[PDB]
Design a binder for this molecule. Structure first.
Ligand SMILES: O=C(Nc1cc(-c2ccncc2)c[nH]c1=O)c1ccc(N2CCCCC2)cc1
Length: 255
């Protein structure tokens, strides 16, 4: 019977979701048996840059809560020199586990999910945050609504969602998140990411950078959706569509 106290409130552990990185995620219940998700971070072996990365992520998460409901609720938090305890809202499943399980993907639910992501990523952009590591795992379904859980600020990993400008910078702008968001919608449309096919990562990273490598957009009934994908997957960030432009796109506005 494991428990935890956060700002003088007792939470009984229902079960553990995530682990590793010195961070554990738990489904918990308060005194009134209400569900919440608690993120625990151990700071015992964490360096100054890491601590400040964790302090920056919490500050933004807490500020940005008032600006969108597509951003995970942070109810409370405890921060000492030894740990972080984050009392957040509980979701049913993250988008990665959801997409992996689902065979069919309803065009209406795909559209609703797209709108949700755009609003969340748009909010963070307005406060000068560029995630730069967006993947389905960064989104949580919380009662048929997608919510952004991470801001890329704090510390198996895919390379399929990486923008060409991220590789070239060896340059990151809001446009980098548009590429990654485009890969999520490409996956929700074609059941794969634009460069999933390539096994050799050195060849895969070269393909994303190479403009001669043609991204395949098989014809679909939703002509609008196919345009969104072609606009997001433009290799030149200057020629790539912006998030305010995507919110004005027929695919999000016309039903
Ligand atoms: O990540 C999950 N949840 C939560 C994560 C966070 C969170 C916030 C900030 N930084 C990290 C995590 C907040 N609030 C949650 O609720 C999750 C739940 C169930 C699940 N699965 C069940 C079905 C089979 C498949 C597995 C899968 C995932």
């Amino acid at each position: 019977f494991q428990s935890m106290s956060v700002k003088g409130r007792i939470y009984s552990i229902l079960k553990q979701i995530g682990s590793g990185g010195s961070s554990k995620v738990f489904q918990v219940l308060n005194e009134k048996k209400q569900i919440y998700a608690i993120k625990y971070v151990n700071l015992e072996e964490a360096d100054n840059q890491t601590l400040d990365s964790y302090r920056n992520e919490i500050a933004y998460l807490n500020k940005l809560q008032q600006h969108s409901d597509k951003i995970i609720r942070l109810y409370d938090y405890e921060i000492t020199d030894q740990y972080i305890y984050m009392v957040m809202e509980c979701g049913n499943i993250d988008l990665n586990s959801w997409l992996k399980k689902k065979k069919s993907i309803d065009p209406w639910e795909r559209k609703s999910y797209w709108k949700n992501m755009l609003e969340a990523v748009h909010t963070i952009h307005q406060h000068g945050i560029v995630h730069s590591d967006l993947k389905p795992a960064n989104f949580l379904i919380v009662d048929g609504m997608l919510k952004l859980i991470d801001f890329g600020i704090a510390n198996v990993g895919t390379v399929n969602y990486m923008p060409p400008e991220a590789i070239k910078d060896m340059k990151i702008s809001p446009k980098s998140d548009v590429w990654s968001l485009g890969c999520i919608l490409y996956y929700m449309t074609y059941g794969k990411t634009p460069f999933q096919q390539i096994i050799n990562q050195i060849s895969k990273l070269h393909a994303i950078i190479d403009p001669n490598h043609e991204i395949e957009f098989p014809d679909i009934p939703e002509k609008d959706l196919q345009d969104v994908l072609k606009c997001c997957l433009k290799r030149d960030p200057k020629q790539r569509i912006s998030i305010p432009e995507l919110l004005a796109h027929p695919y999000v506005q016309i039903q």
